[PDB]
Design an enzyme around this catalytic site. Structure first.
Site, PDB file in Angstrom:
ATOM      1  N   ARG A 226     128.986  65.544  25.161  1.00 26.92           N
ATOM      2  CA  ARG A 226     127.901  64.888  24.437  1.00 26.92           C
ATOM      3  C   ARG A 226     126.677  64.637  25.309  1.00 26.92           C
ATOM      4  O   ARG A 226     125.576  64.463  24.774  1.00 26.92           O
ATOM      5  CB  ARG A 226     128.394  63.568  23.845  1.00 26.92           C
ATOM      6  CG  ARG A 226     128.940  62.603  24.880  1.00 26.92           C
ATOM      7  CD  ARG A 226     129.227  61.238  24.282  1.00 26.92           C
ATOM      8  NE  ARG A 226     129.643  60.279  25.301  1.00 26.92           N
ATOM      9  CZ  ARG A 226     128.803  59.579  26.057  1.00 26.92           C
ATOM     10  NH1 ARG A 226     127.493  59.729  25.909  1.00 26.92           N
ATOM     11  NH2 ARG A 226     129.271  58.731  26.962  1.00 26.92           N
TER      12      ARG A 226
ATOM     13  N   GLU B 172     132.646  42.713  35.408  1.00 24.06           N
ATOM     14  CA  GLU B 172     132.912  43.418  34.160  1.00 24.06           C
ATOM     15  C   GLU B 172     134.250  42.995  33.562  1.00 24.06           C
ATOM     16  O   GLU B 172     134.373  42.855  32.339  1.00 24.06           O
ATOM     17  CB  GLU B 172     132.883  44.929  34.397  1.00 24.06           C
ATOM     18  CG  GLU B 172     133.108  45.773  33.151  1.00 24.06           C
ATOM     19  CD  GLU B 172     133.512  47.201  33.476  1.00 24.06           C
ATOM     20  OE1 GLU B 172     134.249  47.400  34.466  1.00 24.06           O
ATOM     21  OE2 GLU B 172     133.094  48.124  32.745  1.00 24.06           O
TER      22      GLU B 172
ATOM     23  N   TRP C 283     126.367  48.888  32.572  1.00 29.84           N
ATOM     24  CA  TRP C 283     126.274  49.092  31.132  1.00 29.84           C
ATOM     25  C   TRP C 283     124.828  49.185  30.656  1.00 29.84           C
ATOM     26  O   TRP C 283     124.565  49.061  29.456  1.00 29.84           O
ATOM     27  CB  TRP C 283     127.005  47.973  30.388  1.00 29.84           C
ATOM     28  CG  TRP C 283     128.495  48.108  30.408  1.00 29.84           C
ATOM     29  CD1 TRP C 283     129.362  47.494  31.262  1.00 29.84           C
ATOM     30  CD2 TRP C 283     129.297  48.906  29.528  1.00 29.84           C
ATOM     31  NE1 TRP C 283     130.654  47.863  30.972  1.00 29.84           N
ATOM     32  CE2 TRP C 283     130.640  48.728  29.911  1.00 29.84           C
ATOM     33  CE3 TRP C 283     129.008  49.754  28.454  1.00 29.84           C
ATOM     34  CZ2 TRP C 283     131.694  49.367  29.259  1.00 29.84           C
ATOM     35  CZ3 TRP C 283     130.056  50.388  27.808  1.00 29.84           C
ATOM     36  CH2 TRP C 283     131.381  50.191  28.213  1.00 29.84           C
TER      37      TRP C 283
ATOM     38  N   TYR D  49     135.397  46.589  24.435  1.00 30.05           N
ATOM     39  CA  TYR D  49     136.335  45.851  25.269  1.00 30.05           C
ATOM     40  C   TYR D  49     135.990  44.367  25.270  1.00 30.05           C
ATOM     41  O   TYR D  49     134.825  43.980  25.399  1.00 30.05           O
ATOM     42  CB  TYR D  49     136.323  46.384  26.702  1.00 30.05           C
ATOM     43  CG  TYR D  49     136.210  47.884  26.851  1.00 30.05           C
ATOM     44  CD1 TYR D  49     137.295  48.715  26.601  1.00 30.05           C
ATOM     45  CD2 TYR D  49     135.024  48.465  27.279  1.00 30.05           C
ATOM     46  CE1 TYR D  49     137.189  50.089  26.757  1.00 30.05           C
ATOM     47  CE2 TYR D  49     134.911  49.831  27.437  1.00 30.05           C
ATOM     48  CZ  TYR D  49     135.992  50.639  27.175  1.00 30.05           C
ATOM     49  OH  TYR D  49     135.865  51.999  27.338  1.00 30.05           O
TER      50      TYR D  49
ATOM     51  N   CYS E  29     137.342  53.958  26.621  1.00 27.67           N
ATOM     52  CA  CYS E  29     137.877  54.967  27.529  1.00 27.67           C
ATOM     53  C   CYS E  29     139.280  54.589  27.998  1.00 27.67           C
ATOM     54  O   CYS E  29     140.237  55.336  27.772  1.00 27.67           O
ATOM     55  CB  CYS E  29     136.932  55.159  28.717  1.00 27.67           C
ATOM     56  SG  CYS E  29     135.349  55.867  28.243  1.00 27.67           S
TER      57      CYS E  29
ATOM     58  N   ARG F 267     141.650  57.870  27.854  1.00 30.49           N
ATOM     59  CA  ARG F 267     141.386  59.106  27.121  1.00 30.49           C
ATOM     60  C   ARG F 267     140.410  60.005  27.872  1.00 30.49           C
ATOM     61  O   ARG F 267     140.538  61.235  27.840  1.00 30.49           O
ATOM     62  CB  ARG F 267     140.850  58.789  25.724  1.00 30.49           C
ATOM     63  CG  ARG F 267     139.514  58.061  25.716  1.00 30.49           C
ATOM     64  CD  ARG F 267     138.797  58.218  24.386  1.00 30.49           C
ATOM     65  NE  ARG F 267     137.496  57.559  24.388  1.00 30.49           N
ATOM     66  CZ  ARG F 267     136.367  58.141  24.779  1.00 30.49           C
ATOM     67  NH1 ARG F 267     136.379  59.399  25.200  1.00 30.49           N
ATOM     68  NH2 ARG F 267     135.226  57.466  24.749  1.00 30.49           N
TER      69      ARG F 267
ATOM     70  N   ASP G 279     135.812  59.587  34.046  1.00 28.78           N
ATOM     71  CA  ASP G 279     134.780  60.008  34.990  1.00 28.78           C
ATOM     72  C   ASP G 279     135.315  59.744  36.392  1.00 28.78           C
ATOM     73  O   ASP G 279     135.302  58.609  36.874  1.00 28.78           O
ATOM     74  CB  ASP G 279     133.477  59.258  34.730  1.00 28.78           C
ATOM     75  CG  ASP G 279     132.328  59.745  35.600  1.00 28.78           C
ATOM     76  OD1 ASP G 279     132.546  60.612  36.474  1.00 28.78           O
ATOM     77  OD2 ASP G 279     131.197  59.256  35.404  1.00 28.78           O
TER      78      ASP G 279
HETATM   79  C1  LIG Z   1     130.153  55.488  43.587  1.00 26.88           C
HETATM   80  O1  LIG Z   1     129.438  54.341  44.028  1.00 26.88           O
HETATM   81  C2  LIG Z   1     128.862  53.530  43.072  1.00 26.88           C
HETATM   82  C3  LIG Z   1     127.776  52.734  43.479  1.00 26.88           C
HETATM   83  C4  LIG Z   1     127.134  51.879  42.566  1.00 26.88           C
HETATM   84  C5  LIG Z   1     127.558  51.799  41.223  1.00 26.88           C
HETATM   85  C6  LIG Z   1     126.804  50.841  40.302  1.00 26.88           C
HETATM   86  C7  LIG Z   1     127.054  49.383  40.690  1.00 26.88           C
HETATM   87  O2  LIG Z   1     128.332  49.184  41.119  1.00 26.88           O
HETATM   88  O3  LIG Z   1     126.190  48.511  40.618  1.00 26.88           O
HETATM   89  C8  LIG Z   1     128.661  52.594  40.795  1.00 26.88           C
HETATM   90  N1  LIG Z   1     129.118  52.545  39.445  1.00 26.88           N
HETATM   91  C9  LIG Z   1     128.484  52.933  38.323  1.00 26.88           C
HETATM   92  O4  LIG Z   1     127.340  53.390  38.298  1.00 26.88           O
HETATM   93  C10 LIG Z   1     129.260  52.771  37.044  1.00 26.88           C
HETATM   94  C11 LIG Z   1     128.583  52.841  35.807  1.00 26.88           C
HETATM   95  C12 LIG Z   1     129.287  52.697  34.596  1.00 26.88           C
HETATM   96  C13 LIG Z   1     130.682  52.484  34.597  1.00 26.88           C
HETATM   97  C14 LIG Z   1     131.428  52.346  33.278  1.00 26.88           C
HETATM   98  C15 LIG Z   1     130.803  53.277  32.265  1.00 26.88           C
HETATM   99  C16 LIG Z   1     130.269  52.914  31.051  1.00 26.88           C
HETATM  100  N2  LIG Z   1     129.791  54.051  30.428  1.00 26.88           N
HETATM  101  C17 LIG Z   1     130.015  55.139  31.236  1.00 26.88           C
HETATM  102  N3  LIG Z   1     129.670  56.448  30.941  1.00 26.88           N
HETATM  103  C18 LIG Z   1     129.982  57.316  31.865  1.00 26.88           C
HETATM  104  N4  LIG Z   1     129.730  58.670  31.774  1.00 26.88           N
HETATM  105  N5  LIG Z   1     130.622  56.989  33.072  1.00 26.88           N
HETATM  106  C19 LIG Z   1     130.973  55.727  33.391  1.00 26.88           C
HETATM  107  O5  LIG Z   1     131.531  55.461  34.454  1.00 26.88           O
HETATM  108  C20 LIG Z   1     130.639  54.700  32.376  1.00 26.88           C
HETATM  109  C21 LIG Z   1     131.366  52.420  35.829  1.00 26.88           C
HETATM  110  C22 LIG Z   1     130.661  52.560  37.042  1.00 26.88           C
HETATM  111  C23 LIG Z   1     129.295  53.454  41.727  1.00 26.88           C
HETATM  112  O1  LIG Z   2     135.767  52.755  32.051  1.00 25.42           O
HETATM  113  C1  LIG Z   2     135.266  53.854  31.899  1.00 25.42           C
HETATM  114  N1  LIG Z   2     135.819  54.944  32.468  1.00 25.42           N
HETATM  115  C2  LIG Z   2     135.280  56.169  32.310  1.00 25.42           C
HETATM  116  O2  LIG Z   2     135.851  57.093  32.865  1.00 25.42           O
HETATM  117  N2  LIG Z   2     134.153  56.336  31.566  1.00 25.42           N
HETATM  118  C3  LIG Z   2     133.463  57.618  31.312  1.00 25.42           C
HETATM  119  C4  LIG Z   2     134.361  58.749  30.763  1.00 25.42           C
HETATM  120  C5  LIG Z   2     133.284  59.706  30.226  1.00 25.42           C
HETATM  121  O3  LIG Z   2     132.666  60.411  31.302  1.00 25.42           O
HETATM  122  C6  LIG Z   2     132.267  58.729  29.603  1.00 25.42           C
HETATM  123  C7  LIG Z   2     132.437  58.631  28.082  1.00 25.42           C
HETATM  124  O4  LIG Z   2     133.549  59.420  27.660  1.00 25.42           O
HETATM  125  P1  LIG Z   2     133.167  60.109  26.256  1.00 25.42           P
HETATM  126  O5  LIG Z   2     131.778  60.899  26.411  1.00 25.42           O
HETATM  127  O6  LIG Z   2     134.235  61.057  25.874  1.00 25.42           O
HETATM  128  O7  LIG Z   2     133.012  58.986  25.116  1.00 25.42           O
HETATM  129  O8  LIG Z   2     132.506  57.442  30.237  1.00 25.42           O
HETATM  130  C8  LIG Z   2     133.570  55.243  30.981  1.00 25.42           C
HETATM  131  C9  LIG Z   2     134.093  54.012  31.122  1.00 25.42           C
HETATM  132  F1  LIG Z   2     133.496  52.953  30.528  1.00 25.42           F
END
Ligand SMILES: COc1ccc(CC(=O)O)c(NC(=O)c2ccc(Cc3c[nH]c4nc(N)[nH]c(=O)c34)cc2)c1
Ligand SMILES: O=c1[nH]c(=O)n([C@H]2C[C@H](O)[C@@H](COP(=O)(O)O)O2)cc1F
Ligand SMILES: NC(=O)C1=CN([C@@H]2O[C@H](COP(=O)(O)OP(=O)(O)OC[C@H]3O[C@@H](n4cnc5c(N)ncnc54)[C@H](OP(=O)(O)O)[C@@H]3O)[C@@H](O)[C@H]2O)C=CC1
Ligand SMILES: NC(=O)C1=CN([C@@H]2O[C@H](COP(=O)(O)OP(=O)(O)OC[C@H]3O[C@@H](n4cnc5c(N)ncnc54)[C@H](OP(=O)(O)O)[C@@H]3O)[C@@H](O)[C@H]2O)C=CC1
Ligand SMILES: CN(Cc1cnc2nc(N)nc(N)c2n1)c1ccc(C(=O)N[C@@H](CCC(=O)O)C(=O)O)cc1
Ligand SMILES: CN(Cc1cnc2nc(N)nc(N)c2n1)c1ccc(C(=O)N[C@@H](CCC(=O)O)C(=O)O)cc1
Ligand SMILES: COc1ccc(CC(=O)O)c(NC(=O)c2ccc(Cc3c[nH]c4nc(N)[nH]c(=O)c34)cc2)c1
Ligand SMILES: O=c1[nH]c(=O)n([C@H]2C[C@H](O)[C@@H](COP(=O)(O)O)O2)cc1F
Lengths: 506, 506
Positions: A242, A279, A301, A327, A387, A408, A411
């Protein structure tokens, strides 16, 4: 010609081993390890020889060790013949006489201080190295373990253990100098292509395998995550999703983590533990207001809660950072009619978390300790479907609380390290409120994938040898799970590699 | 002194290898296996020798095999010297001259008929046996492979393959005549008790390990289930539950099964495949009436749907076999207000199965193909909460449909074999309706347990060496998933061990 092994306990970063003529720590299990590793022999009519320096001989009280022969290196100590369990030599080279003769000696161990360690590696006498990595760095040292030369390769890394809130590991370093089953599998892999399921689960290549020299001793549970990265880089199919960023994806994986002796916080990368907790407590409180995380300088978020994103997925009526029932709204008010993030939902819906805690301590051996977030009736109202979909909890016979989690979509670059630590903390919280100890953590993954803009970063992370997990303890015993605060968490012994920046796909 | 190996393809039960001077089957991949296994050599300046009987020499057209030397055993064939790739000997013992001399021969293979096989094992010339087990028994044979003597032990068993709806395996039999890492792990296991997670996951003992001689070649995916039994017998904690029958339980396991080349129906025990299908189509139709299964002579839901059981769990108001909202009511009418099993629920609730099929073919690479049955708002009305709780589906790049299933509680004696076959059939149904091929099946288990009245039975099942999985094909292409009937299923090549009676805990 027999084996010569170094036994040493050094700090994780600076390799400190001593201070003011004594050890900078007191770990009982490490001393038991030194005893069992130096007494390990094959011939009952033979003894092992422990070579040590004079100052180390002073630090142990100048008394012999049971069932072993101590060899002291000194220029002044009298070569006494009264004690048959203690012998003195003038230099380290002459002390290598257990090889030339004395067939009553089976194995040789080097235990001495920095001077003995340095001269044993310089003169190339050492075959094996038994290393205990201790997670203590912000203290004072005056004696260090010399850098391991490139001729040695690690072959084993144990799980992380804990003693008095101190994390430590056990590693083995080796000096680098039937086929019928493997050949048949290869021939079947040439006849059948991807019809043979083994060819769909190819073993990762050496160039994408973290610390490839450790083949049969990948006991440290951080490998459960690192090897998952390698498995994706090897078998991941290039697929669109997506978002505009494509991934390499495989289906059906799992990871196990211990929580009794350590906390599974990744060491190959500095993980924002504070944002993870904020979180989790945001979920526990039942909150869906995205601003409350931004007010606490947590922006994980923000991407999925912007005005442009909400209108793009068909939720333009929604306020700026109102994420909808997600959640913590299925956790505390399941099947509750959602209006906005400002309304009062106290009493409406099923409170799974409350009933979970109630069932965990009133019926521990029940097989239904389940917390779910997948509500098909509310998915259309969610800014993002769950997720980490469903989690199950289990009380062992020794009053430990284990946790299973099904995810499911994963990332692996960003979400996975957060999910591992998040549900680890949540299991610890549930353990304290219900009166248990932390157990095990197993995460079962559906679509495990790596975003294509994380390839350079994750390959950099795979070049870093893991370090022992830290410890996480609570400073006070709360009465309600909602009362946890960030100041109540103490993170002991966390010495990670530098942080790695990775962009989130919106 | 070099190696001598038997290569043979025999039927699974009677070990038939020939009929009327030819093979009783036509499997192309098996001939390719014979070619690659007999051409496998280490020295490019050497050849392999293939010993065969005269009648086998006739069946192959009396023409030489590329890159190899054929040795024909015959009393009448002229010992011709014109062809250097074909040589004739008067007896099998004299043909063992590739050992005594002829250093240009690297390996020796015995390929001849029954007479050559029997005389090679009787005179004790054979070191290895390459066996292809073919799942064809209800045909006519006149030439058989002799019984493998007790001096041989199996060391490898491949996954089940398929050619023209015929299942076959590959096995290796062998004749029975660093330690530093293992010792260190043992020493750490003595210092730390159950604090070391490895001691909580002890490797099963030989006495409870199915076919212990196969150590590194446990490729057949029935071992994914059998080894799970062994893991429970080794580490299972004795725990009580809601029934009067206690179990031995562990937490957090998984099993993988291939569905491209076979159907994962257990062979170490005759599984009631008809009852499995009738329950699955009972779910798909959205039915919760327990009588409809009893009317079809399926009594698997009789215990949990009796008048005594329903009144005991607080549902005395319910009709006799009305199970309430369960599987197939959350599938087709999720969050629907349940009244009785006689009311019409067409249109009420969320139809997950319909939306699942719609999403599988309109957006295959979507990461949300999820079917759930855990509804906290309806658990109190259920005669039994969902065991197979949530399932996720995945469309590969080559148009295959894989399935993940999370199961909170797993009766390994009765429920587990049903769950494996049930969701395997369901994945095949979804594949045909959506236009895909079957992929992989992974089952993630929470509380994996064995009821104490199944110990004698499951230990008997662990004494049976697995057989190749059968094939399951559909006779017609349906237009709706609800149109499947038992007559539409064809089970090809299922030759299991006798059935094992086990009582269900109510
Ligand atoms: C590797 O080092 C770092 C350094 C700093 C940070 C930011 C901070 O810790 O301030 C991070 N972590 C993130 O940026 C991050 C952002 C979103 C989530 C959950 C989430 C929601 N929706 C999503 N959609 C997708 N695709 N993927 C996701 O992961 C999520 C989890 C982690 C990692
Ligand atoms: O806790 C989380 N763990 C995680 O792996 N994602 C990632 C998985 C995927 O890369 C994206 C959304 O999945 P989807 O596009 O299938 O809805 O968020 C998001 C979170 F909030
Ligand atoms: N963490 C761990 O595994 C271990 C830590 N330690 C710690 O290290 C500290 C002490 O070690 P350290 O300071 O390095 O001292 P050493 O243990 O290395 O002993 C040094 C002495 O050995 C003799 N010696 C060394 N080299 C030679 C040589 N080339 N020829 C002749 N004699 C030699 C000398 O004795 P002399 O002056 O008589 O000639 C010298 O003073 C302590 O704190 C101890 O607790 C010690 C062992 C293990
Ligand atoms: N499934 C599989 O892997 C294989 C199956 N087959 C099948 O088996 C069938 C044929 O095999 P089979 O009927 O057993 O016949 P054989 O292949 O065993 O050949 C028999 C002949 O070998 C010679 N011979 C055997 N033993 C001796 C001895 N002790 N001394 C001297 N000569 C000996 C004899 O030839 P002579 O009369 O000239 O003296 C005898 O007639 C065919 O259907 C074939 O397709 C064959 C090979 C492999
Ligand atoms: C100061 N010192 C040197 C020392 C300390 N820790 C180490 N730790 C490691 N991992 N490796 C070493 N070589 C090592 N050496 C010591 C201290 C105590 C004993 C000792 O008492 N050993 C007893 C064991 C005592 C017990 O069982 O706890 C034995 O039987 O060998 C040995 C060396
Ligand atoms: C009748 N017969 C005996 C035969 C048949 N199937 C077997 N199958 C097995 N598993 N083992 C055997 N010893 C065996 N032997 C045959 C038939 C064909 C060829 C044959 O043509 N072999 C070619 C391969 C042909 C192809 O690549 O398909 C080769 O290069 O060796 C050999 C033996
Ligand atoms: C091993 O060989 C055989 C031979 C014959 C049969 C009966 C037949 O096939 O006709 C069986 N299968 C069963 O008896 C059976 C009974 C109930 C289910 C599901 C189920 C509901 N509720 C549960 N509660 C508990 N504890 N366990 C469960 O397994 C279930 C699954 C299987 C097995
Ligand atoms: O499909 C099923 N699979 C299964 O394993 N059980 C068993 C698991 C357990 O032994 C029992 C009920 O689990 P619980 O007592 O925790 O509700 O039914 C039941 C099914 F219907």
């Amino acid at each position: 010609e027999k084996n010569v092994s170094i036994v040493v306990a050094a700090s994780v970063l600076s390799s400190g081993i001593g201070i003011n003529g004594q050890l900078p720590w007191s770990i009982s299990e490490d001393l038991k390890f030194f005893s069992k590793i130096t007494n390990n022999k094959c011939d009952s009519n033979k003894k092992n020889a422990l070579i040590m320096g004079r100052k180390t001989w002073d630090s142990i009280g100048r008394r012999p060790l049971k069932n072993r022969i101590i060899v002291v290196i000194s220029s002044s100590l009298p070569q006494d013949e009264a004690d048959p369990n203690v012998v003195v030599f003038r230099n380290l080279e002459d002390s290598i006489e257990n090889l030339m003769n004395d067939d009553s000696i089976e194995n040789i161990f080097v235990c001495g201080g920095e001077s003995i360690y340095r001269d044993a590696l310089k003169d190339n006498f050492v075959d094996r190295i038994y290393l205990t990595r201790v997670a203590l760095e912000d203290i004072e040292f005056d004696t260090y373990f010399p850098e391991i030369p490139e001729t040695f390769l690690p072959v084993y890394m144990s799980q992380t253990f804990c003693t008095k809130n101190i994390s430590y590991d056990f590693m083995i370093f080796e000096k680098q100098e039937l086929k019928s089953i493997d050949d048949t599998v290869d021939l079947l892999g040439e006849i059948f292509g991807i019809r043979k399921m083994g060819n769909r689960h190819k073993f990762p290549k050496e160039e994408i395998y973290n610390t490839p020299s450790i083949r049969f001793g990948r006991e440290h549970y951080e490998f459960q995550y690192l090897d998952l990265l390698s498995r994706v880089l090897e078998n991941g199919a290039y697929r669109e999703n997506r978002t505009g960023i494509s991934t390499y994806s495989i289906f059906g994986q799992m990871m196990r983590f211990d929580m009794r002796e350590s906390f599974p916080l990744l060491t190959t990368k500095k993980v924002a533990i504070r944002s993870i907790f904020e979180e989790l407590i945001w979920f526990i409180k039942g909150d869906t207001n995205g601003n409350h995380l931004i007010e606490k300088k947590v922006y994980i978020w923000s991407g999925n809660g912007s005005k442009e994103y909400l209108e793009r997925i068909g939720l333009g009526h929604r306020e700026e950072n109102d994420l909808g029932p997600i959640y913590g709204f299925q956790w505390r008010h399941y099947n509750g009619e959602y209006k906005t993030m400002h309304d009062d939902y106290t009493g409406v819906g099923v409170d799974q978390l409350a009933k979970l805690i109630e069932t965990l301590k009133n019926n521990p051996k029940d097989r239904r300790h389940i917390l779910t977030a997948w509500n098909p009736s509310a998915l259309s109202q969610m800014a993002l479907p769950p997720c980490h979909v469903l989690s199950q909890y289990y009380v062992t016979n020794d009053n430990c609380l284990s946790c299973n989690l099904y995810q499911r979509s994963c990332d692996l670059g960003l979400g996975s390290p957060f999910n591992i630590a998040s549900y680890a903390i949540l299991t610890m919280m549930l353990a304290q409120v219900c009166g248990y100890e932390p157990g095990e953590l197993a995460i079962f993954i559906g679509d495990a994938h790596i975003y294509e803009n994380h390839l350079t970063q994750l390959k950099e992370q795979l070049s870093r040898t893991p370090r022992p997990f830290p410890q996480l303890k609570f400073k006070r015993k709360v009465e309600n799970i909602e009362d946890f605060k960030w100041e109540d968490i103490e993170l002991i012994g966390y010495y990670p590699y530098p942080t790695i920046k990775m962009d989130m796909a919106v």
